[PDB]
Design a protein around this ligand. Structure first.
Ligand SMILES: Nc1nc2c(ncn2[C@@H]2O[C@@H]3COP(=O)(O)O[C@@H]4[C@H](O)[C@@H](COP(=O)(O)O[C@H]3[C@H]2O)O[C@H]4n2cnc3c(N)ncnc32)c(=O)[nH]1
Ligand SMILES: Nc1nc2c(ncn2[C@@H]2O[C@@H]3COP(=O)(O)O[C@@H]4[C@H](O)[C@@H](COP(=O)(O)O[C@H]3[C@H]2O)O[C@H]4n2cnc3c(N)ncnc32)c(=O)[nH]1
Ligand SMILES: Nc1nc2c(ncn2[C@@H]2O[C@@H]3COP(=O)(O)O[C@@H]4[C@H](O)[C@@H](COP(=O)(O)O[C@H]3[C@H]2O)O[C@H]4n2cnc3c(N)ncnc32)c(=O)[nH]1
Ligand SMILES: Nc1nc2c(ncn2[C@@H]2O[C@@H]3COP(=O)(O)O[C@@H]4[C@H](O)[C@@H](COP(=O)(O)O[C@H]3[C@H]2O)O[C@H]4n2cnc3c(N)ncnc32)c(=O)[nH]1
Ligand SMILES: [Mg+2]
Ligand SMILES: [Mg+2]
Ligand SMILES: [Mg+2]
Ligand SMILES: [Mg+2]
Ligand SMILES: [Mg+2]
Ligand SMILES: [Zn+2]
Ligand SMILES: [Zn+2]
Ligand SMILES: [Zn+2]
Ligand SMILES: [Zn+2]
Lengths: 366, 357, 352, 369
């Protein structure tokens, strides 16, 4: 009936459940118009597409679970290739679509924030965080934005690897490009904008990023995850214990090893920094997947805050960092150095141009 | 504040029929069973006070409409335009979610399996569609290049990788959707394990990418989405100074003797599942679980020695792709990948080196 | 050696033309005769449905000389090259993805509001297709500092911010950024900054608000007027460029504002507010203007003082022209509604 | 009153099975993979005068099978034009309709001209967006019979940092031209062949385009295209005659030898002497320096011919390097660079306008051995 059709239009918000197009407006010529169709998953005729002689059309005809709002072209397609769009497939997509709309309508407003994606090109594969997945994880926490945000992609390493020019580009990406793009947004978000930031880039560059947004109010760190993408793996998980080994007595450069994503072999630290006094922060079971929720990041921040103070009093010389940590925790490491820790930190990193030996990269200081 | 019919239909639709202040579904009377009295169940109020369009018309239930202080002309006394727009933006994001499924189909096989079990694009497209992944052009169907007289050497494998990445980087240029994102990659492989690990090496694991797994019975559809991942049991390597060898007994139990045969003095560590099997990839979480368990142990093994880890794997094709994609960080430990030679009595031989020399 | 389904696919994918000589094979329908698909053309494997070609009877006689149903030479390269050409043409409509941009001063936004609907229908007529809501901007009013360098730099940042956030929305067949369809209605200096913001090195199409035709082009067939240049007088006074395009600027009002000005001038025979007859008029104004600015820029290193009576679209293009790496100093003057419409300096472009 | 099947089959054919308004392919469903016709034959003028765009003076019986009145549309583009007759008037649609059919016919009747690698090189040193559309290059290529196996290479230089176009910037440029570009051309190798033709269009730093040309002039089968402020990638005028290129020779002396190119604009001699005191200026120009002067590729050939021998001459006149001050379009900067690949083995110091130093010419790249 006309009432059920109006309900199909309402609960779908007038978009095609299969492609997402807005069926309430014509953006080419600018006229509000209803150009959608209410499609039947199960046909009245059991000889039609997805027709089953063992089906009660007396009930499903008005069941909002048998009725999808589809643009004209998607309806043509599901009805002309029933083998390719079986009932089970379409009913699944149908309920999932309605759920996301309900969840969006019932999410309490949490405020505004600037989406910020920072990604490098130093991997030997594509490295691309989808903007949509960051905006979706923000929206699940009530956060919205006026624009799709800032997305900074570092220049790729040249023929000499990650050389001086490369690390200069990184500095210009963090300290100049990001600043300019944030300044261009002042008139819109104001002078107290929250930063919804996710990063997947060189560890030293994420630390530098963190230090340059560390004095920013309302910093929400998100995380790219190999299984869950921008979704938090498990909101109910407990942070691990961040085990700490203080460094041994003596002179020699003080090295801070962080074994969070993996166990950093001591033999690689002393190879690069002979005579190193190794202090180590680790978790019981190092793992790439350990960033289960933001409380894990806060817990890492809390544990590191205390150890950096201890180490900064155990030496007058720079602290040499050898880190195997997730990206989100590299940002947070850097954020601790913005005003709370003014000691000098020299960041070593794996060097593909040197058989995976650690070599010095950026220096982070006051 | 009064409005016309078309105006209310637009406000109800663009709000999904919920109160923008408390999120209550104002289609309640419909779900109960009573006829819908759209007019009495909700007050459509402008979002902003009077200050000298349907985008600034809100939908409020009567409760919230009575709590909002209004002036005599029906406008809100305080400015609700910020929450109104936020609420609309959250609905748009959800309603546009289907276009976040733009995807590239990728089928990679060996010249052999393209003659044996040639996977058709249609099998992948329907499995993709089922999960909301929507191709927009012909899929990429690739066959690994047969080796010339130089063989499968470093240059050969570098040309495979180069060839696979060229092919998809051109399709990843085809940005689209609401925000201009690159499409997702939907990939399935069927080739020898080393060649599959090179597929993972080419694609990585730092993008929106969904692996699929060929299965004769289900084709590229998941056998059982509800199945829980199996436990991945680990036997630590023995003490000694011999070459370190990681054995993966996932599809089957690799005879220890076959490993010692190909690698004299091999200290064997082994990840395995309680009941190895060819059909253990019941869904995608199985693949993720394998990655997590594997990397936890590779962390332990790489720290044991600077010398190469020798890999002897009886693992499903999908897991061989993920294994290759795992080892695409900047950090690289030397891995020497062994494969059974079907032309010489299934003896393990060294096919592929990964990482430093 | 083909079934009706295959012939239909080959006929559609090729647009009914012979893949070797390009003669139209739908001629029967065109003249008025019944369409005999299988008599006017032959389908043939390209090498000795994606690998079948459509050939006219003649070309078939020249390829299949042994009438064995296959060619004597591998024609796969020409066949596939042919289908690509067809595909690029058939998908050209998606090359029109576009962003509506309406930029007005707060004054014109109230007295002469341009509706998005007017721009969109002008765009659609030319094959430009918006996919989301249009951008509608109003120039922010200054503060007590007035229109200092900071004000104009902030106008530019806010315009570029919104502009670049929508140029991220790539799409179509090749992931191209969408085209910018922009119309402006504001004071001349503020329109020059809109031009400084958008540039002229991207797929961008200016539209023009016309007092009579609104955002539609008065006469797509109109030829552009000749642009007339009076070189400046010899001397050592400040250099001025008067643009009398929509009206004659009185030389006395230039010198009153710029004592001792050596006035060069660009104009048209019949200055008129309605002269923006089509987009070719805007292009022709740029070409003439740049040819003379090159002359004027080579005269002196000192700035060029600009007094312009020009349509709004020509003010944007003026601004867009001056976005190369090279930058001569220009001091743009505009009539102050407070000071009896006296030309005042309002905007500086380029070096101090 | 109802279009017949013969005419519907004609509409499908003359449109190659795509929507004349959005370009979607209406012969296949790429999501599930099944070939299918899902396009509709839409009528611009309806049989009923009350229909969308209905006219009373319209002889319906004499246009139901008139392909000039029938478009192939996707189901959604059909709902829209019939639900907003005012926003899709008869003349708008009719024009879009005939233009579509014309592009199809020009394609179908273009003689093949072999393959080429599409190549776009653009910088980010302007204060505005700078983006050459990929489709416009491919359409320019197709117009000359050239097709490609992929959409080609598109190289966007790193933007200048906070210090302007400093040493880091030009190192990035060199890396983009000499390393990244070579890398991408290698990976394509095998899809095109040993020595394929290049369809190259550039819009980047004048010194970078010269370096680009030098790196590819040794390559054979270079087809240069040009971005034009009015015509985009379409050649402004294929019939226009090349301009007269005017060469003023340098005076004998000891000053440094400067080559001034006044083509897009007149380079002031003050700015050359400011940066290079006592320069000996040899200038190549045209009667009316203009940004729009790249009317066709013959203009580019004529600029090449006008300096191919001049550079040899100038090289003998001085042992020191030749100092270049060029106001030229982006396509001639690529051509200038190609001339220097090996034909002219000599050091060339390329000066360019420095936004940091108040538009003064300052040295940037060095080109030669
Ligand atoms: N296994 C191991 N890794 C070591 C060792 N010494 C240094 N490392 C480095 O630690 C990082 C571990 O990877 P991650 O995924 O946990 O975190 C990285 C890191 O925050 C950032 C940059 O990556 P990279 O330069 O490879 O640093 C990698 C390793 O070299 O990005 C994160 N990241 C990279 N890829 C992903 C991804 N797919 N998803 C999420 N985050 C990612 C050592 O001894 N052993
Ligand atoms: N039982 C057993 N297998 C061993 C042992 N040592 C090594 N192997 C190898 O493990 C693989 C197990 O087969 P799979 O189907 O689980 O996975 C294969 C593999 O990922 C890839 C190539 O196959 P192959 O070279 O035979 O490697 C096979 C075995 O030799 O493709 C997968 N694959 C092959 N055929 C199919 C198929 N029909 N369907 C799905 N996946 C397939 C050892 O000791 N024992
Ligand atoms: N007659 C005359 N005009 C002079 C003189 N010195 C300066 N001017 C300015 O030239 C412009 C002429 O009007 P226009 O419509 O051709 O162009 C204006 C201009 O581009 C922009 C802002 O308007 P304004 O600040 O008045 O500049 C007006 C004049 O002051 O907007 C354009 N514009 C204004 N109204 C409309 C409209 N209704 N439709 C289209 N464009 C409009 C001088 O000596 N003499
Ligand atoms: N007017 C003028 N320009 C001078 C002078 N001395 C040096 N120049 C430089 O010459 C070029 C003139 O502009 P163009 O468009 O004719 O050529 C440029 C050039 O080939 C390349 C990079 O631009 P840029 O670094 O600004 O060089 C500009 C100028 O600084 O790209 C070309 N280019 C730039 N913008 C476009 C565009 N929109 N469309 C097409 N090509 C473009 C001097 O005295 N006067
Ligand atoms: Mg149906
Ligand atoms: Mg239909
Ligand atoms: Mg023959
Ligand atoms: Mg119709
Ligand atoms: Mg329809
Ligand atoms: Zn749809
Ligand atoms: Zn409420
Ligand atoms: Zn022919
Ligand atoms: Zn369409």
């Amino acid at each position: 009936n006309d009432e059920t059709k109006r309900i199909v239009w309402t609960q779908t918000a007038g978009h095609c459940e299969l492609c997402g197009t807005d069926l309430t407006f014509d953006y080419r010529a600018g006229k509000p118009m209803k150009w959608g169709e209410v499609a039947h998953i199960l046909p009245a005729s059991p000889k039609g597409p997805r027709g089953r002689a063992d089906h009660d059309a007396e009930a499903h005809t008005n069941d909002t679970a048998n009725l999808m709002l589809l643009c004209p072209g998607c309806h043509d397609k599901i009805d002309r290739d029933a083998d390719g769009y079986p009932e089970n497939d379409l009913s699944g997509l149908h309920q999932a679509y309605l759920e996301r709309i309900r969840l969006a309508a019932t999410t309490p407003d949490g405020g505004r924030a600037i989406p910020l994606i920072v990604q490098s090109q130093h991997f030997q594969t594509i490295n691309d965080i989808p903007v949509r997945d960051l905006l979706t994880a923000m929206s699940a926490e009530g956060l919205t934005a006026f624009d799709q945000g800032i997305k900074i992609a570092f220049a790729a390493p040249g023929p000499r690897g990650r050389d001086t020019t490369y690390w200069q580009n990184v500095k210009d990406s963090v300290q100049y490009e990001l600043e300019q793009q944030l300044k261009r947004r002042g008139g819109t978000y104001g002078d107290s904008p929250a930063l919804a930031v996710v990063g997947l880039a060189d560890i030293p560059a994420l630390m530098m990023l963190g230090q340059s947004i560390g004095d920013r109010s309302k910093r929400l760190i998100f995380s790219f995850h190999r299984e869950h993408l921008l979704r938090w793996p498990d909101q109910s998980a407990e942070p691990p214990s961040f085990l700490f080994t203080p460094p041994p007595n003596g002179d020699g450069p003080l090295a801070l090893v962080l074994s969070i994503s993996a166990q950093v072999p001591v033999r690689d630290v002393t190879d690069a920094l002979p005579g190193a006094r190794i202090a180590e922060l680790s978790i019981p079971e190092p793992s790439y997947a350990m960033v289960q929720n933001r409380r894990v990041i806060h817990a890492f921040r809390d544990a590191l805050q205390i150890r950096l103070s201890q180490l900064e009093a155990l030496t007058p010389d720079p602290i040499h960092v050898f880190a195997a940590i997730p990206a989100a925790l590299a940002i947070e490491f850097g954020a601790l150095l913005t005003t709370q820790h003014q000691h000098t930190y020299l960041i070593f990193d794996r060097d593909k141009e040197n058989q995976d030996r650690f070599t010095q990269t950026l220096q982070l200081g006051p």
